[model samples]
Target: VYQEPTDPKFPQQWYLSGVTQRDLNVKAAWAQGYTGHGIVVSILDDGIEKNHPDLAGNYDPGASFDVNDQDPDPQPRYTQMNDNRHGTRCAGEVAAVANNGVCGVGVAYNARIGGVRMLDGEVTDAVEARSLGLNPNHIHIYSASWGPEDDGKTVDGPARLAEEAFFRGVSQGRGGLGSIFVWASGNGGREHDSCNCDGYTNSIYTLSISSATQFGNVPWYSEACSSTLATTYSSGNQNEKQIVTTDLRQKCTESHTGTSASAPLAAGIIALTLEANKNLTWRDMQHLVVQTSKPAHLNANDWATNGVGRKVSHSYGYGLLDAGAMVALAQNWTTVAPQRKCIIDILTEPKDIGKRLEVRKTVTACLGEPNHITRLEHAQARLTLSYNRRGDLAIHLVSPMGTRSTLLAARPHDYSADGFNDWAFMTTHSWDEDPSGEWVLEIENTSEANNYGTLTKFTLVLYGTASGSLVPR
Candidate 1:
C-alpha cells in the first residue's frame, strides 16, 4: 500500500529522499497506512496562508487563531518585504496536501494544520499564554519555532502566564492526554550559544529539536546543548539544499531554512506517531522519541554513548528522528507511568568564584520516598547566581553514571551584569541511568579578564518513573 507523492516538487525534497539513507525514512511509515490522519498540529508563529492551494485542503479552522489581531483568522499580514512567510512555510512542512502537483509533500500530508498570528506583532506574556493555551483540547500538537532572542548574550524563557499555559497544556489539555509542544533549539551555533541558556528549549515540557543538513552534517546555525531531544533535516551552508515547502502568496519555495524548519518537520513526524496511537501522553511522546531516534550518518565529534548504551550528543541529542521507527514503536506502545520528581539541595550557602570552582555532591536519589527516581529522564539544576560578566561562566553536570552534560557554555557575547536567578537548566543526556551516587557541578570563569561571581543557590531535580522495568524500544 506504499505510495509516493505525485507532487511536482517531491523530487526536490532532499530531506525526504535525496541522500540515500539519510532522509527521515517516512516512506516506511507511509506504507503501513499512517499518514497522520485524524491528528491536528498548530503552528504558533506569525500566520499561515490557509488558502494556499497546497494547504487549504487540510486546513483546520478549529486549530487556527489570531492573538495579534484578536480575531479568529490566522492569516499573515501582507507586507512588501514578505517577512511574515515563516508560518506559511512551516505549515507546509506539516500538512500541505499531497499529489496536488503544486509543491512537495509534507512529512504528514493528511494531518490537520493551522497557525496562530502571535509573532507578527509584539510578543508579550499574555500573548504567548493565549497562543500556547489556545484550544489545546482540539490542537493535539503546537509547533513553535520562535523563542527568546537567540543572541548568545541573552538568557530568557517563558514568563509566569506562559509557564502556566505549558503546565496546563501538559496536565489538562487533549482531554488529559496532554498537548505536544515541539520547539526549535535555536539558531545560534555560530555565536557559540548554548541552548541551555534558552529557557524554552531547556524546559522539560518541550521536545527541543535541532537541525541537520541534507548530507547528514550539523547545520551551521544549529546550537548544541544537552537539552535538545533530537534533530531533523534542514538548511546548511550555501552549497547545501534548503527545505522545500509552501511559501507566501500562494507560491512554493525551496529555500525555507533553519532550526525553525526542523521543529515543524519533527512535529509532522510526531503527528504520524499520534495517528498510530492517540492515547499517548506528553511524556510518553518524549520517551518514544528518545528510544526510537537513530545515531547513524550524523557526523558530530561530541557523539558519545550514555550509561544506557544510547548514543547522545549535545549537538544532535539522541540523533536524527526516524518516522518509521517512531510510528512502529508508537503502535504497540504502553502509556508510561506517572512522572516522579526528586529534588536534592546541593548548596544553600553562597560560594564565591574568583577564577575557577568545582562543587561535588553525593546523592542517594531520595531513596525510600514516594518521589524517588531510580531511572533518570530529565535532570534539572536550578541555579541562582550573580556575575560581573555572564558570558565568562560555564556550567557542567556529571551524573552518577559518569555522563557529563554541558549545562552552559561560555558565550563571548554575553556581557550582562545580571546573572541567572533561579533559572532551571535541564539535560536529557543522563537518560535511563541510575540517579544514585556522586554528582559533580563544575562552574568555571573562562574569561581571561578579572571577572567574579557568586553562586547563591544550587538544587538538583530528577524526573523519571519509579517503575523498575524499561520501556521496550
Candidate 2:
C-alpha cells in the first residue's frame, strides 16, 4: 500500500491521482511506490517562479537557466503580467513538492523540476535552439506548453536552429537514451484549426498531448488532428474544474487550464515510467504509451482501431495517458528495435481543374526487402498544391491496412489563396501497419463549386521498425 497526500488541494488534482474512478488511474502507480523519484523534467516557457513554496523543495537551480538573457537563473522579468504564471503552473503540475500540506500534489511530486525563460524573448531560431539545447545529458524530459499562436491561417514550425536542437536532443541527449519532448497540442479547435499544421507538435520526436474534461469529453479549445499522441484531464466547459497547481508570487491556484496543463501532467507520468524501469529507452517509452493508454470513453466516434488493432483517434491519439498501465508495462517491457525510415516521392500528374471542384489520386507503393520498411509508426506527406481557397479543401490519407488519417479538414477560417507550398502533413493513425501497399490521397473541395485546387506534387515518407526483423513480444 502507498500513502496519499494530505494537502487540501490534492483532491482537486483529478488528472493526476484521479477521481470518481473515471480518471487516468494514476493512483495505481502511486500504490506501487513509484512517485517519480530521481526523474527530471524541464519546463520550456516564460520562466518558473523558483521560490514558490510548493515548487521550492524539488527545484534544482542547476536545471534551470534563462535562454533570453543568457543567465544562470530563469526568473521571470514581468511578475505583474498574467503570462508569467504559465510556466509556474506547468511546473507545479509536474513536480510541486508534496506532503507539505500547502498546494496540490504534483503528478510526480518527487521528481526534479526546472525552467527555461525563452518564450518571453523574441521568437527566433536561436532562442528556440537555446531552449531545446539545454543540458540534455542531465534532463530527462522537456515539457513545452507554447507553440505558434493558435491562429487558424498561420502555418509555422521550428526553424533551422530549432530543428538541429531536436536532432541533437534525440541523437545524443540523456546519455544517448534520448531526451523525451512533451508538447501541448494547439488549443484552436474552436477556430477550426488542426494540429497537423503545427510543425512542433506534428514532429515524431515530440509527444503531442491534448486535454479532456472531467467527464472525459473533448474540450472546446483542444484542437483535433492526426498528430496528437495522447490526452490528459483539464478544464473544458465552465462547469468543469480546472487544474490545481502552484501559482506565481508564492501562492497556489486551482484554475490552471487548457492543453498547456495537459502536457506537463503527461510529462509527470512519464517521469514515473522512467523511474519504474530505468532501462526503458526513448522508443520504449513511446511504444509503451501506445500499448497501454486507455481511452476514457470508448463511445466517442473518433475512436478507431489501427492496423495493429490499437485504438486511435484524431482527438486522443492512442488514448488518455494511463500512468498505472504504462508503469506496469514498463516494468518488464523490452526495448523496441532500431527505427527505420522509407522515403519515396510520388510522381503524379498535376491535378488540373477547369470546372471540377473535387479530385482524388491514388499512389500505390510497393515496398519490401532491401531498405525494407514494411511496418508503420508514423506517416508524413509533403505535398504541393495551387488553390483558390485553402478552407475549401479537405485532405484524407488512406492506408493499405484500411486506416484513414485526415491530414486536413475543411477550415472555415482559413480563406487564404496561398496553397500548400511543400507543407508537410503528419499522422499517427497508421501505427503498427504494413507500409507495402496502395496509399491513396483524396482531396475534396467541401464548399460549393467555383472553389477548387490543383495538386501539383506529393511525396510519401514512412517511419517505423522493420517488419519480421523484430516482432512484438
Candidate 3:
C-alpha cells in the first residue's frame, strides 16, 4: 500500500486545473472539428450518474453492462450498497460539455459513453469485457483506472492477461477501433513502482498516464517509474479534486475515485479529436498527444537511488499532460484513410529543465497505412531541432493493429550536428501478430548526460506517403 496523506496539501493541487486545455492547446485540435462525434468510449470501472445533465444524452443505454447485476442493463444510476463514484469521475473527463457552468469541460465533450459496472460492487460480471461476444464497432476509447498490485514478474498474471486481451483487439484492427486506450500511471510515486515502474503501466498496448502538479511537477500522489508513457493533470485532493462533470443521484455512494479521473480526462480530448477528424485512427491520436504535450519540470526521483548522471526520478514521466497540443494535433493532422498524421510547433521558447532541453510539440498518426506505404524515402518530422545538450532524441511510433515500425536510416543518436537538431526514426518492427489497430509516434528530447546543455529546436519532415508491408490484396 502507498502512504496516506500526512500533509494538508498531500493531494490538493492538480496538474491541469482551471488552465489545462487552454494552456495545453486542446483548442488546436478542436479547430480541426474532431468533437469525437460518432465515437464511443467504453469505461469499465465504477458506474456513472446516468441522468447527469452533461453526459445523459451521450450515454449509451445499450452499452452499460453489469457483471454483478448479472443483468445486461447497467443503469446510469448507482445500485444499492455500491459506493463507487469512480465511473462518474472518469466519465466527466471524457464527455462533460463545457459552459454548463457547473463543472469544467471534457476533452471529447460530445462523444458517447459506455460503462461496464465492474466496480459497482464486485468485478464478477466485469470479465465479460475481455473475450467472446464483445462488441467491436461500439467503442473508440476504453478508459480504465483499476490496476492490480505490483508483485513483480511472478505475480503479474492479471496484468499480463489484460495486456493479451488488449492485443487481441489490436489484432482485429479494433484495439479500440479508431479510438485510443488510456490508463493512469498511478499515485505511488516510486513506492508502488519503486522507480515508478508499474507492470500494467508498462503495457505497450495501453497508454498509461502519470500525475503532475499545478506547475506540471509530480504531485505528492503521483506514482512513477521508468516506463511511464506521458503525464496528465488530475484532481489532487478529496476536496479540491478539480473534476467537473456528470454526477449520479446517489451522493455518498462510491461515485468518486482518484487518478481514475485523469484517464477519462485524456479520453475526452481524444473524443474531441475524433469529432474533429472522424477518420482519425487510434495510432494518429496517440502520436498527436505526446508530441504536443506541454513540457513539465524535471526533478530527481527521491525513490530511485541511482548514483548520479541519470536524471529521471521514477515519479514523473515526460513532465505534465497538455490538452492544447492534443487538440491541435487532431485538428492539423493529415488524413490518408489507413494512416493519418498531425504535428504542431509548441514553443518558439525552449526552457532549460535540469540538463535536458525540452520542446513542447505534438505529433499524431492513425490507422494502419495501405499495403504499400509511400516509401521509407520520405517519412520524417515537421520541426527540425538543435540542442545544446548532447543527449539523445527519442521518438516513439504508435499505430493501429496493422502497420509495422522500422528503423530505416539511423538509430537515435547522442551526437548532434547543430546541438539543437535531432534526427530520429522508427525502424521496421513487426506487427504481424496484430493485424489492424491504431498507433502513434512520440518524439522526446531524452538524454543520458544530466549536465548536458539545453535543447533547442525540433522539426518533422516525412517522405512521400507511407505503405504497409502487407501488400494490398
lDDT tens readout by residue for model 1, 334-359: 88888899999999588997888788
The runs of at least 3 residues in candidate 2 whose Cα sits more than 4 Å from the true structure, single-residue gaps closed, are 353-370, 467-473
Per the 3 Å backbone cut-off, how many clashing residue pairs does candidate 1 have? 0
Candidate 3, 301-326: lDDT as tens digits: 33221111112233443344556556
Please rank every candidate by TM-score, starting with the best.
1, 2, 3
**Candidate with best lDDT:** 1
Which candidate has the top score in TM-score? 1
What TM value does model 1 have? Answer: 0.98
lDDT of 3: 0.47
Estimated TM-score for each candidate: 0.98, 0.95, 0.58
Deviation from truth (RMSD, Å), model 1: 1.3
lDDT by candidate, in order shown: 0.92, 0.83, 0.47
RMSD of each: 1.3, 2.2, 14.9
What is candidate 2's lDDT per residue for 1-473, written digit by digit as tens?
47788888988877666557667778888888888899989999989999888999999776798988889798877645676788899999999988998988888889999999888878689999888989898889999998887877767788899999999998888888888999999889789888888899988888899888887788889788898888888887788888999988888998988999999999999999999998777777777787788775723577887777778888888888888898998988777767777777875478764344333334433344344676677788888988898877788888877888989888888888888888779998887777777787777777775876677777788777764433432
